[PDB]
Amino acid sequence: QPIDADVTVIGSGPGGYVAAIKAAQLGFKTVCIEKNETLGGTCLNVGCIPSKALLNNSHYYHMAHGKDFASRGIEMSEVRLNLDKMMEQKSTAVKALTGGIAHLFKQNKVVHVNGYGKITGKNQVTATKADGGTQVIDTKNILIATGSEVTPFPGITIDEDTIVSSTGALSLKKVPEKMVVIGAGVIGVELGSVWQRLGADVTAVEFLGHVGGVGIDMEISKNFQRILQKQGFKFKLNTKVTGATKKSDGKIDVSIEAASGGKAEVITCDVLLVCIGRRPFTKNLGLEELGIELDPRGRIPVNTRFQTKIPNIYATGDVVAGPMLAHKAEDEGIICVEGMAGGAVHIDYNCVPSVIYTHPEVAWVGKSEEQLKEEGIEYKVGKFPFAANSRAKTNADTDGMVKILGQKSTDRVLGAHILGPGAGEMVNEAALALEYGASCEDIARVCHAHPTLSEAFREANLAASFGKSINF
Amino acid sequence: QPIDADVTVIGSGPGGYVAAIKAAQLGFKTVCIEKNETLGGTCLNVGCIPSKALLNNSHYYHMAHGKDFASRGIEMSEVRLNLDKMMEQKSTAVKALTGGIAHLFKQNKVVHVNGYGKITGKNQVTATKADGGTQVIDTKNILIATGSEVTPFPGITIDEDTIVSSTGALSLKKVPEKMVVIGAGVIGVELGSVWQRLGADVTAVEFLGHVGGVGIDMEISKNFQRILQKQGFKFKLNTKVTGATKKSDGKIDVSIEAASGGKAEVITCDVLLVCIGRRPFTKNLGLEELGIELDPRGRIPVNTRFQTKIPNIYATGDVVAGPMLAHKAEDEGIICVEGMAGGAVHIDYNCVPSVIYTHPEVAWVGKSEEQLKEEGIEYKVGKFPFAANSRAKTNADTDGMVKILGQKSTDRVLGAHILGPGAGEMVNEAALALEYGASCEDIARVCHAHPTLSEAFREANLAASFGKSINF
Ligand SMILES: Cc1cc2nc3c(=O)[nH]c(=O)nc-3n(C[C@H](O)[C@H](O)[C@H](O)COP(=O)(O)OP(=O)(O)OC[C@H]3O[C@@H](n4cnc5c(N)ncnc54)[C@H](O)[C@@H]3O)c2cc1C
Ligand SMILES: Cc1cc2nc3c(=O)[nH]c(=O)nc-3n(C[C@H](O)[C@H](O)[C@H](O)COP(=O)(O)OP(=O)(O)OC[C@H]3O[C@@H](n4cnc5c(N)ncnc54)[C@H](O)[C@@H]3O)c2cc1C
């Protein structure tokens, strides 16, 4: 009647669903508990996969509705948007990738239980399904992958109809004629670009003086904001939000002020997206009874082998500290279940890439010029514009640069920052180079194809090691 | 007018113009000679850059003139083609990239002499313009970057109007109702897909039984063929050409025969593309006088320092052996002039990547399954479909795979073969890996961002190291 297992994973997010497959392949009789009807967690159901699809489709619309396709001799008339099919394709891809996780849990002999899991004891988790029936799992180890949730703004309640979160902004029924986005982070900037390409008047408000979020280079952030501001993205940065009111007009009066409070304006929008961030989700789990406290932000503190104060209970993902990105949770899930099977658990979050999937794309691996200034590390700067990269000018996407930072003495690649085309696929090369402890010269002396956008990466590294690049 | 110089470079091709800039940066009084009106060589004026530009715009057209855009809700009414605007984007990019080399040549203080170069002496080069001063360049070292030319077809005279080659096919005024391409290699497959997307009955005739030329993996070339055949491409592999006639109608009859015998057919077409291959160019160079004999293929025999029989005379590029690729010539040009400065010259023609810039893309590096069996090496195979990659299923590019080959004992990556989206930029990661001598497990344990097409590279390496993949 109960389930006896070795590793029980509370969560089907990226950190959890991978760890279940991995632990299953390593011999561990694995069990995964998921509360939501669909598997995949945020990234699949209401996260990376939906946002990327609309980002992709919105760009192709903005190209047809703009001079882009006519510039290349693709002359069309009456370019119109059927948001239904665009949202349908988003749903079709999410639905298809939900079924992938199911097929994987099936062929990799993982047991799925559709309930809300609470750690009843040090070696048992009880999951309450929607019917009220409880499935008691008795397990040797327990992995906490409860994931994350949206941080609510004080004084505003997301109704997911006109005051929406990321969840609602991925399923808007018609293009808002005006949209205000609180939070110029990754999700905010991305989602704002999707709807603005479809005709929305998007203005993003941020208390901070930079767009992008934590970990972006100041030079990259500024140049990124400029290109977006010329695409139609209006940015009210250094601006504090005071309040909001769901007018009887159907619209939402948004009251804003400066961080100092000097200028007090009020803007009005058809749709308000609150994207001030996300936070660790640890509700109704049983951590207080187990006597494991959280940290100030609400994260479960862990060690190198990713276990809490109770050793047989492990925790990975957005729940624990570190960059709340999908691939990070995946890795953490892999190293953790390998540490359980006997392995050297070592992950370097400095080699963790970050990708803004806008167009222009922003993507970086390593330390910013400012992070190194704080740490006192003296460095060199190498830069190659995509205006001088061959495949860019052949494709006409000649916006942005690749900035390579390297220590003066060691020439070691400290950080890499890419603004422009194909930056997302590019950082995975800079990631491999960072893991291999490469220098700027080490990359420059590698055969890079022609014509590719990777040549900007090689030549920017060359601009650091040699001082001068070839084609710039 | 004599020109006292340190290093004189004959040819503005990729191997020449890069080495001229590099040698000038190394301190040499570098001189470059070009017989044509524009710099850049074959790749920039009549090669990679123009072919890639049309491939980009033509793929964009085929998406609109089909179902791709409307599948995502991007609904246009009537799609037309202004070919005299697409060819302009091709020309505008080539012109801009040509002017780039000019500014760089002037920046690094390289002497551009516009004449036909011939080696009058061991330390003397004389260039004859069509009419001019017939400049003498007394130099210490001489670099032969004389390049390549269109290998002709015996029995077929290239008209460049209806009997076109790489050049003429890139500058056609109208779309042929039916086009026939001789040579199903890289250049053939690429340009054939350009006009097929633009509306043409394109058939490719090949003596060999594989597309993509020499080096491509059998399974990859075969799978590439299947997809190309669903996109309208027609392939007459294992078929020899026996004649071509220009009729008074202006059409061309092609006399084809099954190489073994029989299956003799006549093919009428509007335009004939002859791109069976290319051969080095050593014409009117003075090598016979100097005594530099050539191998049977007409290439210049060079040593590891890329010297000819006479040391001060060096040769690099398509004029020497190795794959006829521009990034090969670029690297060969750099390491050569650095060998003059005293640096060690080392080059591995296995870490040289090959990319077919079609949709779907083909890009590989290392050894094929056939080549590994030809050298008696036992290997593991790892595959990951792009149909399982998150970013591909998101962008609806669920076509192709990544194949990883690693020795059954050392697990060292021996060949990485990519068919599908983003292969052109993804392959440069495998180049860095092979240069760093990585194993399948080395790449698999590196953080790859989500969602990126690079995850297919990681997962395929895992499918060869662990045997099983996470998401497949
Ligand atoms: C709009 C948006 C776009 C994003 N884009 C990107 C991007 O491009 N790249 C990127 O790297 N990251 C992106 N992210 C972030 C990424 O989605 C998250 O970092 C990651 O998915 C969270 O990993 P996780 O498994 O720890 O959390 P989750 O995915 O939230 O996993 C938790 C899962 O477990 C369930 N659960 C929780 N508690 C219990 C319980 N007690 N019992 C049973 N089940 C439970 C939850 O319902 C959920 O399904 C994006 C996020 C959003 C919101
Ligand atoms: C359609 C097409 C697509 C291609 N795509 C790719 C691709 O994607 N990637 C890739 O790597 N390669 C590609 N190539 C091949 C690429 O163009 C060549 O491999 C490369 O350009 C040759 O290098 P090189 O240094 O010999 O330059 P070349 O251009 O071959 O060198 C010859 C140059 O020297 C000049 N010259 C010749 N004789 C003299 C003389 N006596 N005096 C002065 N100057 C002289 C010529 O005018 C020319 O400018 C493609 C080729 C074609 C036709």
Residue numbers in the entry:
A (entry chain A), B (entry chain B): 3 to 474
Which sentences from the paper describe this structure?
Dihydrolipoamide dehydrogenase (LADH, E3) is a mitochondrial flavoenzyme operating as one of the components of the α-keto acid dehydrogenase multienzyme complexes (the pyruvate dehydrogenase (PDH), the α-ketoglutarate dehydrogenase (KGDH), the α-ketoadipate dehydrogenase (KADH), and the branched chain α-keto acid dehydrogenase (BCKDH) complexes (c)) and the glycine cleavage system. The role of LADH is to regenerate the catalytic activity of the above complexes by oxidizing their E2-subunit-bound lipoic acid (LA) prosthetic group and simultaneously reducing an NAD+ co-substrate. The LADH reaction is governed by the ping-pong bi–bi mechanism, which is structurally supported by two separate substrate-binding sites; the dihydrolipoamide substrate is oxidized on the si face, while the NAD+ co-substrate is reduced on the re face of the isoalloxazine ring of the FAD prosthetic group. The LADH/E3 component is a functional (obligate) homodimer since residues from both of the monomers have catalytic roles in each active site in this dimeric enzyme; the redox-active disulfide bond (Cys45–Cys50; the numbering reflects the sequence of the mature human (h) enzyme) resides in one of the monomers, while the catalytic base His452′ is part of the adjacent monomer (indicated by ′).
